[PDB]
């Protein structure tokens, strides 16, 4: 039995993903800036193309005002050098006028032939501070506008931030059908839980002991159930996988060995969940750490709870992609959630940018 | 002597450009929808790669809420299939949060190694209406913020729409140096002239008889001079160029031959729509595309018109035609090889010879 009812209860595969490190995220030693691991297009596109070759099924492309690649530019450029991997594009509600966001989503979705998933985030614009309550109300409007673009002939939306009447959706029709691209996002505040329950397809959870993950799932499922919906569930977590547990635990100590700063005595909050990486304030505060078979057993345990998406990362990002991609990924049943959900048409759809008749 | 002082007075070349038709602009017959000419990524990227091979030096990528390609998405994708053509990206002030616009510009500029020019536009967002005065005030703020990103360590901007204090420019440092990417834009209203005089590098003019173009140049130069600046000048115009004038004039009639409009009905069963100058045809204005006239003539007549515009002070030409690929081949094979061409970013010294010491380039990464 899963902790809560999930959208994909008979799916026995998982969408196993990497992380494109677009925001100065890549390191050989945590806290040590390395020019050769900067978030240049050359480096970040290499993470994507390598992840694709290794058989990762999606890749989280973060968005923040840090040295690196604008997320939607990066996704557009990657469309021309990828063929199979999904991309999970962080989009911050309100940062782009939402009708033009819908047109950008339709443009990228046709460039990718439906290999697009969206990570809806609700944080502040760079150099601006807006109250949380307002940011979440604005996120509801932006997502409602996107979902109208994907499903209706016109956008008709009367809200606090935006007001549109009779705006044609023709320039914003995505490649994906049966509802459009999937939304993967998380958050823990009451306002985030309400936005996730009302609008997310995949609820992304940051790493916590399993007892606490179970409560996270019940908390968001109570909001989904109030909207007559179920969710699927994702885990965001760093990765250190090696032939032996000792090699993996030694690598974790190696990663924090230069942090020059002030859990059990070893930084573990659970048998294979290492929070030592939390000292780096990377944005993801824990790693799964163990042998190949231990990491496989942890993935099985998260699957039994109801997790069907894993967004992994490691240090350096290319080197841990190879470890995980060569040791663990061949042993896993993987899927593409857009495909499982029936969003990706087998043939070019009759959209304005596809095979549709021009008017 | 040029009509007005220009920024590039000794330049005897021009930046000769095509148009990527990102907004359902492409037709074989005006007013006749053709599925094969839709603004799909495959079709529009082919206009760009063909324009590059032919030797065009820049290409205008328009931005509007019409079936086609989001401009900055399109430019990012094209970065990976081009190496020498500049791209001229239409950006609408306020449509993206301006700090993230700066970061997007820095991303694209490094993907393109400095082959980016920006067409700053001040029109409404889709589904929205804001008064013209307010849209021009907002355009000043957005351009001011971009120029701070390109020239300063931090953005410090206290304005009506935007207020930023001490925001690092590190995530928004462009590839281009010595002021950053060039801005190409136009407009005729008092507020547009003031924005152009204060902030444009290239003043883009839509097609008019030469005497009126000269008045456009004087009118905007008066605002540039008030800011202690000079501009360079671009002409946006459609193109029909053939071995003989007859073939060209016959093709113009062919392009409007299926247009089921008022004038089309009268002719099938003229002051507004005809030749306003021997080689300037406004009949294409019946199609209500971006651009209401074409240069129409023989190769020799079109070369003569280009030389006449250059003598006035024009150093950029943004051409288009129908179909967009077919007229690129006509112009690109018949006229373009006979022209001295340049890249204005290069003329202006914006493009470093070597990878610059930027955070995305060869710069030292800091924590």
Contacts A–B by Cβ distance under 8 A: 159
How far apart, in whole angstroms, are the C-alpha atoms of residue A297 and residue B125?
A: 51
Of all residues in chain A, the one with the smallest CA distance to B359 is A67
How far apart, in whole angstroms, are the C-alpha atoms of residue A238 and residue A273?
A: 9
- Give the closest residue to A126 by CA, choosing from B95, B98, B91, B143: B98
Of all residues in chain B, the one with the smallest CA distance to A67 is B171
Of A37, A128, A352, the CB nearest to B67: A352
Q: Which contacts qualify for A227-231: CB closer than 8 Å, 24 or more apart?
A: A227/A197, A227/A198, A229/A197, A229/A198, A230/A4, A230/A5, A230/A6, A230/A7, A231/A4, A231/A6, A231/A7, A231/A196, A231/A197, A231/A200, A231/A201, A231/A202, A231/A203
> Could you tell me if B332 and B30 are in contact, meaning their C-beta atoms sit under 8 angstroms apart?
no
Of B65, B74, B107, the CB nearest to A70: B107
Joined tokens for residue B279: 């080689």
Of A41, A72, A125, the CB nearest to B73: A72
Q: Which residues of B touch A175 (CB under 8 A)?
A: none
How far apart, in whole angstroms, are the C-alpha atoms of residue B76 and residue B97?
A: 18
How far apart, in whole angstroms, are the C-alpha atoms of residue B299 and residue A44?
A: 47
The burial class, CB within 10 Å (0-12 / 13-18 / 19+), for A102 is buried
- Give the closest residue to A196 by CA, choosing from A120, A306, A116, A98: A120
Strand partners, B294: B238, B281
Span A15-341 CATH architecture: Alpha-Beta Barrel (3.20)
Of A70, A127, A164, the CB nearest to B104: A70
How far apart, in whole angstroms, are the C-alpha atoms of residue B124 and residue B138?
A: 11
Of all residues in chain B, the one with the smallest CA distance to A76 is B77
Q: Compute the radius of gyration of chain B from its Cα atoms.
A: 20
Give the experimental resolution in Å: 1.9
Task: Residue A346: count other Cβ atoms within 10 Å of its Cβ.
Answer: 7
- Give the closest residue to B162 by CA, choosing from B132, B134, B147, B141: B141
How far apart, in whole angstroms, are the C-alpha atoms of residue A156 and residue A212?
A: 40
- Interface mutation target, options A65, A70, A112, chain B, most CBs of B under 10 Å: A70
Of all residues in chain A, the one with the smallest CA distance to B155 is A127
Our CA-based measurement puts residue B127 at a distance from the nearest CA of chain A, in whole angstroms, of 6
Q: Is A235 left (phi over 0), alpha (psi -120 to 50) or beta?
A: beta
Pairing, β A287-291 against β A273-274: antiparallel
- Interface mutation target, options A20, A64, A127, chain B, most CBs of B under 10 Å: A127
Task: With CB atoms and an 8 Å threshold, state whether A74 touches B74.
Answer: no
The burial class, CB within 10 Å (0-12 / 13-18 / 19+), for A231 is buried
**By three-state DSSP, how is residue A223 classified?**
helix
Residue A210 has what DSSP assignment?
H
- Interface mutation target, options B20, B44, B73, B102, chain A, most CBs of A under 10 Å: B73
State phi, psi for A183 to the nearest 5 degrees: -100, 120
Task: With CB atoms and an 8 Å threshold, state whether A68 touches B167.
Answer: no
Of A67, A73, A107, the CB nearest to B359: A67
> Could you tell me if A303 and A297 are in contact, meaning their C-beta atoms sit under 8 angstroms apart?
no
How far apart, in whole angstroms, are the C-alpha atoms of residue B360 and residue B367?
A: 14
Strand partners, A233: A203, A307
Task: With CB atoms and an 8 Å threshold, state whether B100 touches A74.
Answer: no
Helical axes B190-199 vs B210-226, angle rounded to 10°: 60
Task: With CB atoms and an 8 Å threshold, state whether B73 touches A108.
Answer: yes
Of A65, A67, A104, the CB nearest to B70: A104
Q: Which residues of A touch B34 (CB under 8 A)?
A: 358
State phi, psi for A333 to the nearest 5 degrees: -80, 120
Task: With CB atoms and an 8 Å threshold, state whether B360 touches A94.
Answer: no
How far apart, in whole angstroms, are the C-alpha atoms of residue A305 and residue A315?
A: 27
SS (H, E, C) chain B: CCCCCECCCCCCCEEEEEECCCCCCCCCCCCCCCHHHCCCHHHHHHHHHHHHHHCCCEEEECCCCCCCCCHHHHHHHHHCCCCCCCEEEEEECCCECHHHHHHHHHHHHHHCCCCEEEEEECCCCCCCCCCHHHHHHHHHHHHHHHHHHHHCCEEEEECCCCEEEEEECHHHCCCCCCCCCEEEEECCCHHHHHHHHHHCCEEEECCCCHHHHHHHHHHHHHHHHHCCCCEEEEEEEEEEEECCHHHHHHHHHHHCCCCCCHHHHHHHCCCCCCEEECCEECHHHHHCCCCCCEEEEEHHHHHHHHHHHHHHCEEEEEEECCCHHHHHHHHHHHCHHHCCECCHHHHCCCCCCCCCCCCCCCCCCCC
How far apart, in whole angstroms, are the C-alpha atoms of residue A104 and residue A112?
A: 12
CA dihedral A239, A243, A249, A255 (to 10 degrees): -60
Of A77, A125, A358, the CB nearest to B99: A125
Residue with tokens 């030469």: B210
Domain B15-348 superfamily per CATH: Luciferase-like domain (3.20.20.30)
Of A37, A106, A167, the CB nearest to B126: A167
How far apart, in whole angstroms, are the C-alpha atoms of residue A263 and residue A298?
A: 19
- Give the closest residue to B42 by CA, choosing from A78, A354, A76: A354
Task: With CB atoms and an 8 Å threshold, state whether B127 touches A70.
Answer: no
Strand partners, B166: none
B19-30 burial code (b ≥16 CB/10 A, e <16)? bbbbbbbbbebb
Domain boundaries, chain B: 15-348
Of all residues in chain B, the one with the smallest CA distance to A154 is B127
Joined tokens for residue B3: 């009509």
How far apart, in whole angstroms, are the C-alpha atoms of residue A141 and residue A155?
A: 11
Task: With CB atoms and an 8 Å threshold, state whether B67 touches A41.
Answer: no
> Could you tell me if B315 and B304 are in contact, meaning their C-beta atoms sit under 8 angstroms apart?
no
> Could you tell me if B254 and B227 are in contact, meaning their C-beta atoms sit under 8 angstroms apart?
no
Of A24, A104, A128, the CB nearest to B73: A104
> Could you tell me if B99 and B165 are in contact, meaning their C-beta atoms sit under 8 angstroms apart?
no
How far apart, in whole angstroms, are the C-alpha atoms of residue A294 and residue A349?
A: 43
How far apart, in whole angstroms, are the C-alpha atoms of residue A45 and residue B83?
A: 18
> Could you tell me if A71 and A100 are in contact, meaning their C-beta atoms sit under 8 angstroms apart?
no
Of all residues in chain A, the one with the smallest CA distance to B170 is A67
- Interface mutation target, options A75, A77, A351, chain B, most CBs of B under 10 Å: A77
* End-to-end CA gap in chain B: 54
Q: Which residues of B touch A352 (CB under 8 A)?
A: 38, 67
- Interface mutation target, options A35, A39, A65, chain B, most CBs of B under 10 Å: A65
Of all residues in chain B, the one with the smallest CA distance to A161 is B128
Task: Residue A257: count other Cβ atoms within 10 Å of its Cβ.
Answer: 12
Q: Compute the radius of gyration of chain A from its Cα atoms.
A: 20
Q: Report DSSP letters for A298-357, one per residue.
A: HHHHHHHHTEEEEEEE-SSHHHHHHHHHHHTGGGS-B--HHHHTT-S-SS--SSTTTTPP
> Could you tell me if B51 and B332 are in contact, meaning their C-beta atoms sit under 8 angstroms apart?
yes
> Could you tell me if A66 and A24 are in contact, meaning their C-beta atoms sit under 8 angstroms apart?
yes
Q: Which residues of A touch B108 (CB under 8 A)?
A: 70, 73
Residue with tokens 């193109």: B239
Q: Which residues of B touch A106 (CB under 8 A)?
A: 70
How far apart, in whole angstroms, are the C-alpha atoms of residue B196 and residue B192?
A: 6
Task: With CB atoms and an 8 Å threshold, state whether A99 touches B165.
Answer: no
Joined tokens for residue B210: 């030469």
State phi, psi for A112 to the nearest 5 degrees: -95, -5
Rounded alpha-carbon distances, angstroms, from residue B105 to B8, B81, B146, B179: 25, 18, 9, 13
Task: With CB atoms and an 8 Å threshold, state whether A70 touches B94.
Answer: no
- Give the closest residue to A45 by CA, choosing from A64, A66, A26, A65: A26
- Give the closest residue to B150 by CA, choosing from B109, B111, B191: B109
Q: Which residues of B touch A20 (CB under 8 A)?
A: none
Contact partners, residue A311, CB within 8 Å, separation at least 6 = A17, A18, A19, A58, A60, A88, A204, A234, A235, A236, A237
How far apart, in whole angstroms, are the C-alpha atoms of residue B276 and residue B285?
A: 12
- Interface mutation target, options B76, B128, B162, chain A, most CBs of A under 10 Å: B76
């Amino acid at each position: 039995m899963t902790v809560v009812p999930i959208t994909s209860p008979d799916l026995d595969a998982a969408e196993v993903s990497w992380f494109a490190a677009l925001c100065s995220d890549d390191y050989a030693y945590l806290g040590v800036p390395d020019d050769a691991l900067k978030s240049s297009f050359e480096h970040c596109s290499e993470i994507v193309t390598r992840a694709e070759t290794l058989g990762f099924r999606n890749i989280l492309c973060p968005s923040s005002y840090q040295v690196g690649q604008d997320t939607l530019s990066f996704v557009a450029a990657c469309s021309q050098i990828t063929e199979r991997i999904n991309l999970l594009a962080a989009i911050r509600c309100g940062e782009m006028q939402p009708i033009m966001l819908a047109r950008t989503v339709a443009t990228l979705d046709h460039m990718l032939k439906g290999r697009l998933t969206l990570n809806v985030i609700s944080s502040d614009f760079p150099g601006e501070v807006a109250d949380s309550a307002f940011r979440y109300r604005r996120s509801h409007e932006v997502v409602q506008i996107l979902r109208q673009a994907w499903t209706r002939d016109t956008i008709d939306h009367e809200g606090e931030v935006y007001n549109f009447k009779g705006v044609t959706t023709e320039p914003a029709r995505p490649y994906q059908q049966n509802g459009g691209p999937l939304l993967y996002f998380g958050g823990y505040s009451p306002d985030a839980l309400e936005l996730c329950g009302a609008q997310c397809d995949v609820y992304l959870m940051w790493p916590e002991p399993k007892e606490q993950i179970a409560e996270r799932m019940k908390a968001v499922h109570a909001r989904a159930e109030a909207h007559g919906r179920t969710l699927d569930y994702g885990l965001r977590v760093h990765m250190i996988v090696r032939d032996t547990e000792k090699e993996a635990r030694d690598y974790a100590e190696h990663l924090v060995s230069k942090l020059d700063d002030e859990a059990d005595k070893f930084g573990y909050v659970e048998r294979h969940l290492w929070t030592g990486i939390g000292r780096a304030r990377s944005g993801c505060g824990a790693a799964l750490v163990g042998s190949t078979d231990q990491v496989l057993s942890e993935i099985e345990a998260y699957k039994k709870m109801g997790v069907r998406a894993f967004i992994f990362s490691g240090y350096p990002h290319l080197d841990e992609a190879e470890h995980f991609g060569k040791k663990v990924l061949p042993q896993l049943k993987t899927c593409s959630l857009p495909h499982i959900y029936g969003r990706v048409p087998a043939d070019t759809p009759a959209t304005p940018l596809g095979a549709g008749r021009r008017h």
